[PDB]
Amino acid sequence: TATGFDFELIDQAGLGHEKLTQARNQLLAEAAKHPDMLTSVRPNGLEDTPQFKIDIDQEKAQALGVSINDINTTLGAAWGGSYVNDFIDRGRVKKVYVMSEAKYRMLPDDIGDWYVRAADGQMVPFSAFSSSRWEYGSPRLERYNGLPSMEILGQAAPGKSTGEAMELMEQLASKLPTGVGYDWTGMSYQERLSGNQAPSLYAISLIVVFLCLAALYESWSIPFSVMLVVPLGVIGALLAATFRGLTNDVYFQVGLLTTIGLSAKNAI
Amino acid sequence: YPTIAPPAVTISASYPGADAKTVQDTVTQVIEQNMNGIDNLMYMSSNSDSTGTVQITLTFESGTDADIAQVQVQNKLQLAMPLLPQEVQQQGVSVEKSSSSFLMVVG
Amino acid sequence: PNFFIDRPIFAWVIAIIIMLAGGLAILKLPVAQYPTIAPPAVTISASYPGADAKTVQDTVTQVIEQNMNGIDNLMYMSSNSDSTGTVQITLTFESGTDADIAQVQVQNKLQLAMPLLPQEVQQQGVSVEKSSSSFLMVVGVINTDGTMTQEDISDYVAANMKDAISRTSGVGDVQLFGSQYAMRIWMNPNELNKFQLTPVDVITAIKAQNAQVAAGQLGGTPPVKGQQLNASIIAQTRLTSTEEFGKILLKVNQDGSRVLLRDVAKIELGGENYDIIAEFNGQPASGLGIKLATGANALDTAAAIRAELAKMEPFFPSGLKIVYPYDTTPFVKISIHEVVKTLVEAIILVFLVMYLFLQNFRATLIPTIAVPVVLLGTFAVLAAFGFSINTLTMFGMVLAIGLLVDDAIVVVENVERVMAEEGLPPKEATRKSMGQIQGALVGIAMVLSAVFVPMAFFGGSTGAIYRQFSITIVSAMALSVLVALILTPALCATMLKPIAKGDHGEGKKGFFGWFNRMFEKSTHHYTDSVGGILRSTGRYLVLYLIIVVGMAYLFVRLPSSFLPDEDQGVFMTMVQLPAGATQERTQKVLNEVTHYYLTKEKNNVESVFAVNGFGFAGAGQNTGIAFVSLKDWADRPGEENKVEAITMRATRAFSQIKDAMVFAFNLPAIVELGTATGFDFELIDQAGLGHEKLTQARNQLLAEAAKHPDMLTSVRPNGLEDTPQFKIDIDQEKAQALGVSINDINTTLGAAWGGSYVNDFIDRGRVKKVYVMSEAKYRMLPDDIGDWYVRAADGQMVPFSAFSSSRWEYGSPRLERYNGLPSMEILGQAAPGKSTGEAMELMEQLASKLPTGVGYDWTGMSYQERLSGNQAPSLYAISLIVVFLCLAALYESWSIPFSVMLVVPLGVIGALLAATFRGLTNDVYFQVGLLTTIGLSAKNAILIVEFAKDLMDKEGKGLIEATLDAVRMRLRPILMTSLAFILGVMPLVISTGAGSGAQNAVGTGVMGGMVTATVLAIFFVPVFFVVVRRRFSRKNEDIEHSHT
Amino acid sequence: QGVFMTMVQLPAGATQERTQKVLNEVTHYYLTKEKNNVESVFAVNGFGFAGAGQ
Amino acid sequence: TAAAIRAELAKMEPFFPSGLKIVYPYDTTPFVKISIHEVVKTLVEAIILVFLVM
Ligand SMILES: CCCCCCCCCCCCO[C@@H]1O[C@H](CO)[C@@H](O[C@H]2O[C@H](CO)[C@H](O)[C@H](O)[C@H]2O)[C@@H](O)[C@H]1O
């Protein structure tokens, strides 16, 4: 994108998901307070969903003759599914999945219809050794470079340069709790080191161009007289950009160059 | 367009039934612990999905011959393959070269 | 050529373009200490916790050495089967064999040996790596208050650092000095016996109790029509604490008194391994052992590593500031910086010589500017030729200042000479000088490639050296030549003020002039002399014979060499205890050494990082090592604050008074790679004679080379002799009826004393390991064998004193292997000034008398010397006939070319004699030096004989007449070029610090070589040309002629 | 590019049913008020960009 | 490959029992050898006949 970024907010210390998300609201609300820089600071991930814990009371089955492995894998093969064997149909190998049927594994109540047949020969209801509670948890556990992390997309105000928003983010994500550090990636990475590099390139460009005109003729001042044609070609391109409502994009940029070219040709 | 975007290899594994913390803990951290010592590494990013499918993409320095990156990756992951669970291990981990530029999609 | 003399601005542009091509090719050009020298190798490492030596050799090592079948460019394969259960297979390759393909072929040949390996091995990680050897750097971590112990610190390293600091773009295997946190469970035998339990129930317990679970989903997919909830089932989860681990239940008792883990074994967050302990200055520390990549630039990898770690510094806890024990980086930095400082200085001195000759400042700037631009320019040919800013090419620079100065100098000189000889204005005079010295400049450039090029034709690491040198010299030289045509002559015509006819200084003003008088008066001296010697020829012929032969004897009784040992500012000492030692006694030795260094070396030494448990070939309680860091150089005056004095007398302090062997040393300049005198003999059994017969063959040999003090030094095998072993030859009979099960007896024996990785747990967020082993005291002295019981089929435990046995044998802790077969390795040297080759042949001849199936072979260092070598005589014969042919071209005579080649010794005998007079060695640098030197002589004499023939031909002047005029015209440049050099070189031999051993090695050969060169040739060359041309006739009986 | 796309997201922990609801709405929408611009609408339930989920 | 391989066998020679002998049933090597020696003889000859013609 042009104006903006791909902020990575990273946990570095032995913290937990809750702590990070807390930091994220902290920064996202503190930086949604600057249209003076950033517009649409938004996190790209999935928020904590309602999740349903079945903290088996391990005691109330530990004698019953039932095996944890059996309880787990029946629970599992019940509501998730299991890849078992492979079969050769019509000529081609395919997978063999065994799962519950639809209706007998959907709503929490259905939990009950499931029975573990213990070692002796007696079944056990699941409401005998289980539990049930409702917590939260992310469905998308993101990580950046080996550590827990969370990704905040966002940009800068319509006519503010991407970099300025970046520096203000540095000074804002500066105000975060210990174990929370900052970092950049992808676009904002590729593009972070490559922005204030351009002037050196014109240093080579225009300096080597001046030495060539110094060569052709034989003067150091004559090339000035010829290099003076440069703006002449530009203010016409800009004027067109601004008046056609276009933008300083690359095709305009190489274009701007070519123009500089002929200015120099004719002037030469 | 020309070959423009910095080359990267994605690794994905499916772990039927795993909630996010499970895919982050049986598979994701095991792999993020065994990608130590491949060449030209710019950065690493994981997705531990509530579908049980983990997507760990590694993005590299520009003009880093992909083929070799994809190999140091597939062969540093085929080290942590025993240190993986058996649902995963049997249903395939997948190391692929990554973009999004599908020439065509045919329904 | 000339096009430019009329356009000075065009030429100035060419100057500045080559200049910023210099600077531009300077900011992004490789910088290493050396060129990449180490032949590529792939190391595979395997872990088999609790395994005896013979076990790592037989369960993992030989299963894989059978699957390393069909790898490319394979030079050799070597196994280290360690009694720590860690086997190290090193495969070394042909030179520069791009790692990636080799390492990929090896890992995809190892994936055949992957199913046929244990579940213990396969689970503790097998490792296929690209890697050097010498630690690129070691980064220690400590704490001020020491409110933490080795385990805490080491954890922070392995939980906050070692996971990503090895994930750069050029690090091989970081080696943790400490170990990462783990869930440590220590079984208590008496109370574990009480409540009726084996380790096996502890295993299955913590396993199936503690885990994540393949749960599933509410609203499961595919749902039913109208379904309106989707949410996640989180079932049984993995753990977190030590509580959650105490509470782990094994069985319920009849009354209610449950048997918890908590009770039955002690449960603690503890290291995954308690073998290695790291003490920085006696203070507890945990380090990072960084080994260099398989051909990555050093200072760039360290820069990147310094970047990630400098990024972790904002999240380190209270007081955890990084400490720095060992870095091979600043040596390279300060070294090359001292060579560049010298580049600057040599320029400076040269300008001074030049003022004292051409007493006009704006004229003296002509060749002053002549160099910085031929320099900059070469760096761009290096960027273009795939080289680096290594020591070799750097010394090629500093070295080549001489040819550049000479070229510029003879041009400005020839102009000026003509401007005082006729009275012409500069410009036409410039055109004129050029009209003579032009062709000569291209011909000398040619004969110059003809001598530096064959030197590029050598093989080996050293071959890489001679080629790096040969190129910066020939390349830089072409560049001085083009400068001599575009820029130089335009400058002589341009900034240089005109001297009208016959001015010749001549005091005239009173400072700079009393000189010109001294000198002109003296050039006469010179001329009246040379005439005086051309008078009598035989005499000088004889003196010449004497000079060659003197060169000869001086040459042969000179000790060859390899490279310089440099006080890199950072050294280390190695520790080894007697058979079967303990962690406490090692730590004892290490504490002592640590104490010594902080006293008798209180002013030179700063930090001692003691590494207990990790030696070289591998680990053990017995072995220790100590990376020790010194103070800044400015507080280290004399020669006694240096590596050799410190390490020698330290070694005195520890050798002569100690029980165990402890040495202090500094590693040579090369990161890894063989040294000089010495070798690496591998003695191999081929027809299967077992460990005993082999090691014994090693003893026969260790004694057979003990009968020749005339040759072989340090009669040593480098390995470890067989240690005391304690066998438990289970009688399976007296347990197969007892109600007891074998599988359970094994894994209990193991989990007791070997240990077991069981599950995985969540520490503060980070996955770490789950280990079960005995408690400390129930496995030390042999008796503890008894305290452990197997809970049989019925319910009765059984004593270990029930089914076992017990005896004590011997067997090695390190089963070394070479080329796929069992082997043992004998290091050694040659007598001092004795060649490695002689000792090598005597070694092939003594181990020749060994039992059938025990054969010999060579590796590593000893390889370097067998396929190659002694190519020099032919290389220089090449150089000499090719050069001779070039002089027959240039001179268009066969008999004339001889006169320049005769000047060859004159420059040598000076270098030799300078070496012998200082104490240096016929090492690489002496050869480069002599290269350069024989060069400059060639330059000068060629010039002289050139003028003479011209003046006889293109003026019809006599033989003698012309000879004298030739010498006459150009004594002044020869001296001034030469004199500029020697003064520029002085800094080298005078240099102290940062590889000043190299510098001293340059400066030496060069200075002496030069003195004898000029100061003899400017008297011998006329006698060369004269007597040689008088074994040639036609026209010149004595000549005169005509004109166009 | 002659072909464009729209992204849809249901509130947290929603179901395949509501998703398929929105998607068929949009498909109809394109074939209606855009009957003359749209040729083909390809609806994907369960896979968006933001991540995986019904 | 043949120089290095027959050298490999000659290093294995101190470990061969009674009669456990090497045989060469099949080798593409000497063909290369004589194929080439015939070409050089030809080349040489071509030269000779050229000098003679000239
Ligand atoms: C800024 C310093 C520059 C350095 C310049 C130094 C030049 C001064 C050197 C003076 C020494 C001369 O050394 C040289 O040896 C030869 C020997 O054959 C001598 O030559 C003389 O002796 C021999 C025999 O005795 C012959 O008869 C010959 O006729 C006669 O001229 C010397 O007279 C001189 O020509």
Side-chain angles (χ1 to χ4, degrees), chain C residues 519 522-523 525-526 528-533 535-536 539-540 971 975 1019:
Chain C
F519 190 49
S522 316
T523 353
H525 258 66
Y526 169 54
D528 279 336
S529 175
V530 174
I533 60 185
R535 308 282 275 259
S536 40
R539 169 143 56 257
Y540 296 66
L971 190 77
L975 262 110
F1019 293 68

Side-chain angles (χ1 to χ4, degrees), chain C residues 709-729:
Chain C
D710 331 309
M711 194 59 250
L712 315 311
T713 287
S714 291
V715 261
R716 69 209 315 173
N718 181 258
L720 244 179
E721 200 45 52
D722 320 339
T723 60
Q725 281 180 359
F726 167 60
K727 178 91 186 168
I728 292 80
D729 200 21

